[PDB]
Amino acid sequence: GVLTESNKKFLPFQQFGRDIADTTDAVRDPQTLEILDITPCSFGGVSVITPGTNTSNQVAVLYQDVNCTEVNVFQTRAGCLIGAEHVNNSYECDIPIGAGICASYQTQSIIAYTMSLGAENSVAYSNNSIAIPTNFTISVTTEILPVSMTKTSVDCTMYICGDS
Amino acid sequence: SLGAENSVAYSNNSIAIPTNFTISVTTEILPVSMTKTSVDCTMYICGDSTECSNLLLQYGSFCTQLNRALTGIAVEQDKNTQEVFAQVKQIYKTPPIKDFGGFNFSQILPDPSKSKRSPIEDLLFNKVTFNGLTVLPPLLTDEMIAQYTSALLAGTITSGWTFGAGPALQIPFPMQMAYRFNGIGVTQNVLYENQKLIANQFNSAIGKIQDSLSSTPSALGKLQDVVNQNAQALNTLVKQLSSNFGAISSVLNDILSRLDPPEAEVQIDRLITGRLQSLQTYVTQQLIRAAEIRASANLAATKMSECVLGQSKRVDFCGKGYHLMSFPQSAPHGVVFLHVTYVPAQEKNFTTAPAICHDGKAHFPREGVFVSNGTHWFVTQRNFYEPQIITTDNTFVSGNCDVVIGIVNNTVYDPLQPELDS
Amino acid sequence: ALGKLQDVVNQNAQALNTLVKQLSSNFGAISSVLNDILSRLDPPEAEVQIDRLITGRLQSLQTYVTQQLIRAAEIRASANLAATKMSECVLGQSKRVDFCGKGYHLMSFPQSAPHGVVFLHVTYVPAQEKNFTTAPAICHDGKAHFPREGVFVSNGTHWFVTQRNFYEPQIITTDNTFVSGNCDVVIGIVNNTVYDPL
């Protein structure tokens, strides 16, 4: 872990502190009676933001929840992103990263931009104004719904130990 | 006590018709998303000790199944939020001035003085309050969730129910409320002729809802309950790393600092079984909980589409009373709906008859009911008392008088007679 | 396009593949293959290793059955929604918004699909909007006149009453407006002339 001086006051008899999960959180140095805190080292999952292998083979990486001061470098609230650059143009969401930032392959590199909620439209409002449609467009849409899943069965005796 | 006893008089000739109404704004709170928490199986079960990991790899896919399940829950939370809130193809905006014919919406619209969130949403936000585990951030921030709620309110105020079915068509707000009354069965003269009272009632109700939320701290119980359940479950998972599970010590480093491989391995195995069982129980509880939250998100998306983006004919689905129009509000991990309902109020009991006979014919009310003030007869709408003279415009004819049971004799005025006699 | 059905098949197959693959793990014993464990060790020392293998396999089976019961409940919720669409959207016409396509629902047609149903939602959509001036009611004889099923609209030279969802202008007769009250109470009332068929 990483050791840093701890302000925790140890009574004259006990030496090392304990956390809720029974892992030492603070210890007192044997040579000098000083109180130190034990903090676990930086840890976090790493995710790759990959445009499909057909489109390209360059891939950026996302270090989850670990600011990358421990080793183009965009620090987001989802971690810091390496391999992709911040942009000021907001586009529709293609790859979701988190905290409202999304990345996609643009034409070439990977760009991480603020996600775009959608277009903006202000409808003329007045106390005496109305809009009435004049034509129409019949439209057909599709809704796909799962209805059943394959009916499987497992023999417990044969699976656990077959023919014994 | 189940409820207040109240028996209602019934008679074969009696009717009771409303005479005045009370606009009412009620509230509904629904959980829409959970917290996207992921727990690493190896870094929780075997704490950075390779001697433990080598034993762990012999338990097959148990480590990766739990990660896969938790990832599924975490993605589903984002899908739930997108489904409930992202129902708009455009981000509509309010007009700069607020000439809504007497309706003050300051308590629901976004306020620029502050994060731009409505005065109701601020009160909502304020009220709601090992190495393996981490919390992932939501895809949609609270600012964007408020933008979508702002868009839905702005469309439902300026363009009415037309924005959700196609292009947004503007409408004057009082006309929009008149169509909503005409929807619930009440003619639009009633709104046009009581506009000040209806605006006053609506403004007072919306103002009262803010105090109601503040006065009771337990209004947001559903959202708080969801947050507490998740937190407690994670806390129990962290606590289970303090149990020996039949070994000599819970601490892995100590149990490896005091024994040789042949003797350390048996104790490690005992811990691996216990910790893997505890994590597996946690993952299964999270899958069940996610499923109930998914049902609440699907219900919330249905209420948003069927109630905010239109008018619902479904009883009790958007508040007690007839539903006129609803307003969504964001909340932490949830959505709060504001249902505006028209409630009948001052009932007056009048006598009634199925049909009236004038010239050997039976007349039936075109829309409305037959009532008497005790002496004369009048036909009035079922959901309001606006008594009207029985002309032949508001009734139709079918049959001889004897067939209907309860037929009464009266005079049906005919507009033809005066202009034909002259 | 058929992502939902594909996901259902992919998830179920991945669960079966993991359940079968877990039979290759020794779970802390000395060999996955039961025959080797039984033969290499004498019966009284073979039994404890077999017990460890049985426990691991039984836990893998229990994890599979629990995950399937959860998945099946999600499928049942989707099947119930499909039944509600097949009842309230193809066997009838639904007033409910967004239940059957983003638009006004006219009619729907079902289509089969492997382990699923696909619905074809035919929806009317308003198309070319145009801006007209409106007024709540018109006053002609010192009386109000409210539209019966339409909206008052004016191109600047006349007043017509038209359907709310289609622009078909029509004359303001007394056949389509009902009378209630006088000029003062209704806000914004516009004085105009209502023709009569008499």
From Swiss-Prot, chain B:
Disulfide bonds join C41-C63, C46-C52, C307-C318, C357-C401. Residues 195-245 are annotated as: Heptad repeat 1. Changing S7L: In strain: Omicron/BA.2.12.1. Residues 224-268 form a coiled coil. It comes from the Viruses. The record marks R117, S118 as: Cleavage. Glycans are attached at N12, N20, N104, N349, N373, N409. Changing N131K: In strain: Omicron/BA.1. Changing Q346H: In strain: Kappa/B.1.617.1. Changing D99H: In strain: B.1.1.318. Precursor of the fusion protein processed in the biosynthesis of the S protein and the formation of virus particle. Mediates fusion of the virion and cellular membranes by functioning as a class I viral fusion protein. Contains two viral fusion peptides that are unmasked after cleavage. The S2/S2' cleavage occurs during virus entry at the cell membrane by host TMPRSS2 or during endocytosis by host CSTL. This is Spike protein S2. The chain holds residues 698 to 1147 of 1273 of the full protein.
